[PDB]
Assembly symmetry: D3
Homo-oligomer: 308 residues x 6
Amino acid sequence: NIKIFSGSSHQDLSQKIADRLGLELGKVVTKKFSNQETCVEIGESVRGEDVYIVQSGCGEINDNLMELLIMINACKIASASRVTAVIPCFPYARQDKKDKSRAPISAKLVANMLSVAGADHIITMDLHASQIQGFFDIPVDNLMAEPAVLKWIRENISEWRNCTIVSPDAGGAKRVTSIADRLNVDFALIHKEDRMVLVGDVKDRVAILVDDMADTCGTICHAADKLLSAGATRVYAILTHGIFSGPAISRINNACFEAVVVTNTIPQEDKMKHCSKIQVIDISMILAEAIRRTHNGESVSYLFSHVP
Amino acid sequence: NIKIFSGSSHQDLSQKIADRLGLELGKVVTKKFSNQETCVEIGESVRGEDVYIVQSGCGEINDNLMELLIMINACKIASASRVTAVIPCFPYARQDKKDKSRAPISAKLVANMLSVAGADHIITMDLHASQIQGFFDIPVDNLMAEPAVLKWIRENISEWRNCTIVSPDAGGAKRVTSIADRLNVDFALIHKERDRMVLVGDVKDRVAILVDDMADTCGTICHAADKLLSAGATRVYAILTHGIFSGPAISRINNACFEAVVVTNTIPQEDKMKHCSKIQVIDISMILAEAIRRTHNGESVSYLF
Amino acid sequence: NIKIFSGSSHQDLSQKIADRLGLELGKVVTKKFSNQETCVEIGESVRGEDVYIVQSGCGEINDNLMELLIMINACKIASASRVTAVIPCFPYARQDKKDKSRAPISAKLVANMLSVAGADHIITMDLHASQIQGFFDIPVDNLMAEPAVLKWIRENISEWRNCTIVSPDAGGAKRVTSIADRLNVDFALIHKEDRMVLVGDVKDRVAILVDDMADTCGTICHAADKLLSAGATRVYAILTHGIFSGPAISRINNACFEAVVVTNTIPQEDKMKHCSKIQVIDISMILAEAIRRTHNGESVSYLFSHVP
Amino acid sequence: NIKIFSGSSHQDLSQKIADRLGLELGKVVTKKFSNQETCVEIGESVRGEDVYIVQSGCGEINDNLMELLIMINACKIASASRVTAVIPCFPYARQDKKDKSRAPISAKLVANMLSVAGADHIITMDLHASQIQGFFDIPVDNLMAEPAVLKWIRENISEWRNCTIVSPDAGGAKRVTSIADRLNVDFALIHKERDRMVLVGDVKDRVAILVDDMADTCGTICHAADKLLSAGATRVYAILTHGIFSGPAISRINNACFEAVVVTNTIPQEDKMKHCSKIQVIDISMILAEAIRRTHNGESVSYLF
Amino acid sequence: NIKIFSGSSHQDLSQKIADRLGLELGKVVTKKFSNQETCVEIGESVRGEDVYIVQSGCGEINDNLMELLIMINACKIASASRVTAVIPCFPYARQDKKDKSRAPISAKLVANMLSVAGADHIITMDLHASQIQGFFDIPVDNLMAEPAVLKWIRENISEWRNCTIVSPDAGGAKRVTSIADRLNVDFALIHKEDRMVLVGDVKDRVAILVDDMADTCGTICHAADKLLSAGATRVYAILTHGIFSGPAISRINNACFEAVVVTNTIPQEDKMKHCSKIQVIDISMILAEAIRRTHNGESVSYLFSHVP
Amino acid sequence: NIKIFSGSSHQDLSQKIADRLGLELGKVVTKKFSNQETCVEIGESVRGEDVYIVQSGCGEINDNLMELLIMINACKIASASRVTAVIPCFPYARQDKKDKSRAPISAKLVANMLSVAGADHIITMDLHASQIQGFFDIPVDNLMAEPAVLKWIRENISEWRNCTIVSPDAGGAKRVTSIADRLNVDFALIHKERDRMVLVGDVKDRVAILVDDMADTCGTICHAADKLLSAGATRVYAILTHGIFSGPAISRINNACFEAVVVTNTIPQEDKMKHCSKIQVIDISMILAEAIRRTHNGESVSYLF
């Protein structure tokens, strides 16, 4: 009575999750008008079932969001017992504050939309701001890629016992210090004032830029330069979410990175073809395990410092 | 104290609306990000104001809806006194029932998202189904194109006194019989076998006016037009309040026998009008301005129907 | 842990449903003041149980509605696990639109009342307008009498392969075309302009007026005349909901119908005594099966083209 | 800008109310269907108005409640600025607790239906229990008949300075002691063994005034009156704010020793008053008009208590 | 999958409940700032579990309330299947009406706070006003101490067949008459006009003042005098809730009571040390049994006239 | 038409606020019961008024929150037109995320209780995290102490042009870099190994200004100050918008090398100021009065940031 569904034809990640759970993705008939008006038809009964919808990695965020919302609605009015939105990369999460302007808090709006659509539960990975859990009243499991980042570092960087973890901005301080303390190394921090300022020791050390997401990568590319200018031996970038829109791929190919590491919360395959610097940590097993635990009523906190 | 904002690039309707009310459109900064992630910013204080946001007409329905939702929200958390969504063409309106499938009622979803975004009021034109009004708990004013369509038929088709109004599908009956009764003329109805088309009612040697609420690819109204010709209509017109016109529509129209195709201003046609001469638009901005003004003043909106 | 309750002493239908499920109706103590103020007492524990309340066929709609609402409330605050209102004939369903006047949408109001009373689920039959499902946020199963109408037609009208399905109004087009296409015959349609207009072929064919409901029957009685005037051989009327208030019985006895067929969503027994033209399709088995499926988490979509 | 509508045929209270405020009752079309299915239509625009709907007094409680609910809803979706239900006698008010049964809290249900119908405000008189106010999240103004009942006792019973106020049941204690304290007189209390009636307090050679919030069949206040006679009261009165008076009430009253039976205008008595001379009504329309007017103006309503 | 938690270090009652259910109290890490800002950490998974939080008897009502609310929240966003607040003594219950002033209905506010905090169910004992059940939409089980009061009376007062049950105020009439009728004896009633008035027969009888709560006890102490003045042989006071704040203990020690009987809905141990007149009925078994029944979906109405 | 009430004994802020607006604080009866059970009563009609309730500053956070909640509720059921909570220092603001624990998001709980109590609007100062604004669905105006802190630094520290702003923790980065950028000076950052403190950035032979949003026991800013001395800062200041100052704070401050400790009026300091001379308060009442006045008038509040 567990049933996993996928957003659009970007099955990829959702298929991996389903394989790991010993399941097939449920049937969904998607008819799509040219104005992008999305039609959905759940091709099997979800009556009384524990349902999980994994949002697409299609790219177009608003299409993906509506598809998700529509699919949640269809399952709720078809008497699903529970509907969980598995959203590896939370959309509009950078729009989580007003920030001295007459701005929407779009991430709160997205949380409200998910709630009124009928979501009972959220499974996500590395919310841009932890506080976003509080934008909901339903429970949220905010999974961490940290355990998998720590393990990647230990296994792929020989100098890890002597590296420096660098935040590309002031916001990311906590995230880097927590990784630096766990590994028992230093941290450093960059701040854009168009000028960057680095505080902290990177001289003669491997520098690992750690962030929750990279988009156009103008920031990490510029931070990489600064770090080499400050005497870092080489520079790595580890992001959980690899958006990589616009010139990001061109930016990374021209950059002085030794590697750019991301998870597959966003589909990376086509980006990789055109970019040899990209390596992907598979997090499908962390997503599958959180679903399995959710379903069984078993501890998921164990997924916060364990790689299943 | 009243403020009008527009959604996205399609500032035509909203400009027309703002003119009739003697206003300028509110300032709104709209920066478009990575993967179409919508950014909006209200470039002026709306604190204590009666706000009207007029939908975009730029095709991409999900982008338009999100922008509208984000705008509504932005005005609300910035202490707008009231927020009305002006949605001439209601998105997802066809998806208004399960229809014997495990389908979403997407129009109810949209109603819910609009309400939770903070909309206090809706103004729209010819809801695909009247019952959609009941999808909200806030007031909806569902304006009619009917008066202006009636007006146009009388002022443009010489033989209108012995014309027949034809619904393209069976689910279009109520709309066409209401028009047919107003003009005191005939009505007829087409049905696709669920395949061949079936026509019920008299069209022989009279003008056939195809009336429908919206036409997308125009596949149905095009095939409908053929049948009306096969059944010996003099000439066939096409009246649609919402003229979406996607995919093959442009050419499909021209290649069909249509004397004319008539639509409203609810969606922009300027782009389609040059590549298709037989299209004509009824401007509905006066109707929308009047509804906003009357909504703001608390005067009757009902006489506009 | 399934428990079925009945509205008032109009047990009839609710008793048939209970028999088909192998159950007794649960005890309810109803004390009723003269101003019709309804008192209810649930005479057994519903704590943790899956509860279904079948609304009465008493006649007085507002009494019945309040009784239903009160009973839903009592079961919810007594810790029922789930409360489903089984409402064979949805009240105020004709009040589903504003229709160019300053009217209530009373069917939306009834849906809100059912929701705030604590209904988790609705089971109903042939909503006057499908869109009424959208008046709720809880799931609605809108059961169709169509399968049972098709089977009645095939078994009782020898000429069914050559009949015409007629809508008594413009609103009913879809409903008749769907039946006409399934049976592979014609459809026709009447429109009241005080004048009726018939479009479609009924000459020398059996005409079957099909509608979701009949009240005072002035419409079907007048449509029957029109059809005979247009050369129909005989006229039948098939309604799912037989209200039959006011002069309906006198109207039907004087009418040129060969038969008036209705379901027992409304109690028909006393109406039949005074009206030999009435035949009743028993739909208690469709109601019982939807309850059973709901309870078990089994497909109910099968009830949409199958007669259990 | 203020508008008063009445529910159903009992337009007496509402007429009195509209007069005191210098208004005419709003136009409302009320077509009554098949099985008592209620149809209401607002015959005028209420857009941007402060609306007051005064309950019906036509017996059938479920019909009255539905009509009121439908009216409230109709005004809300037609963009009324505010909707107040004026419910002099709150329906289902006795059903306000489970009371050691698997019973509904029907008064909370009613509170919820009123709120979801769109009521912004309630005005009522002598809630059976004060706590009912807490069944809402919207403001309730719970007016008191007490001042006018006190007034009547002093102006109508000669021996009032040595009278005793008697509660018909034990759950009526707080009401009677509050009256007894205002007049500086005695109080007493009747209890039915849960059978024989038990009386606690002094009534010998004094006037006994039975006070209760509502009397339906009058079975209890009639048996109460006998006991008060048995215990040697001079003469016994009956004061009820809500005089429902169903079933055997009419005659039961006359056949009982009651000097007089006093009720308010909250329910119509004109029909009962002719067949029962000993009934007298305190008109409470001034109190309800004053509460509406003060509610609309935002002036004190609290001094009316 | 039942899990019982306690408010603060006032485990006492919550420990007794847990013992009776064969359970240990779940781990809770409570860190408390000096401004009394309460921090909580649920020290074990509640994912998918039936959770019961027993509110502390600490004394400071607002601290206790917030602790309860915070704990309910933590369990809900940690995916508890159900959260029940077991609140033996409902806080702010005397603030249940406006009472001719511009007052809050604070008990309604407390019910709203409990609801938005995420409480699915309430278990309580002898609400000051039954109507408080209607301040919620979630179900409330309002347990009665009456069965245990009746049994205490029958076992400890030899003259019980000839006693009088007295309400200390006008509000308590119903409560005393119900006890007087069950025991088949008289009732009497006191009313404060600063003057008390007694109606009813207490001459040469044992008088038992029965109330739902005693605070500073100025009322029961004064009622005791009045009763002796009216010829009662001796006076008892039975309260379900023994607040006993301010001079209550000094008031009771100076009073002409034969005994003051209360339940342990409030911790009584330290009050007893300084007051030999106090006897405590243990109601932990009634609380444990309601939890057990709730959990199992079994009748709790049986707890309304049975001492488990 | 506007009314200001204060919560509990700490009537200083609220008095200052009421003065700037030319008002007297509303009458409120506050009787304190048995076990701290809070009683509040509004001593005047607030019907149809724009109500502002200013939080208490009397330490006990749970008592203050309940009183505020009860006050909000009391004004709402007494038909206040609008209720704004003025909460200079937002309670439970640190508890704004789970933070890798099975912890409550207590600030979301508080947001929810405030909303269900009936608050239409919040006015507060320097939310611990901006995202807290998103915990509500009602408008929040989150005022900034930054302008006045900048002002104070320039007008009080002679060497400010070559100073460095130091965050006591790593989670304080964004706050200090924003200040450092405004003054065009350096920033630095302290981190406790999770043990020894680590400092990143230049402080040698310059004035170190410790900036944080709130300081409770001052354990962190005290140890931070030592490190800044160890790393050769000229002298170290401490700027906190919310100066809670509990437990060892008073003496801990004096025993530390702090040139001065600067806080705002958001919490009362008068009691702490006498036993600690190095404390100085920026009065923020003008800012709060201006926000109320502008909120009531519907004028810009955004320029106050």
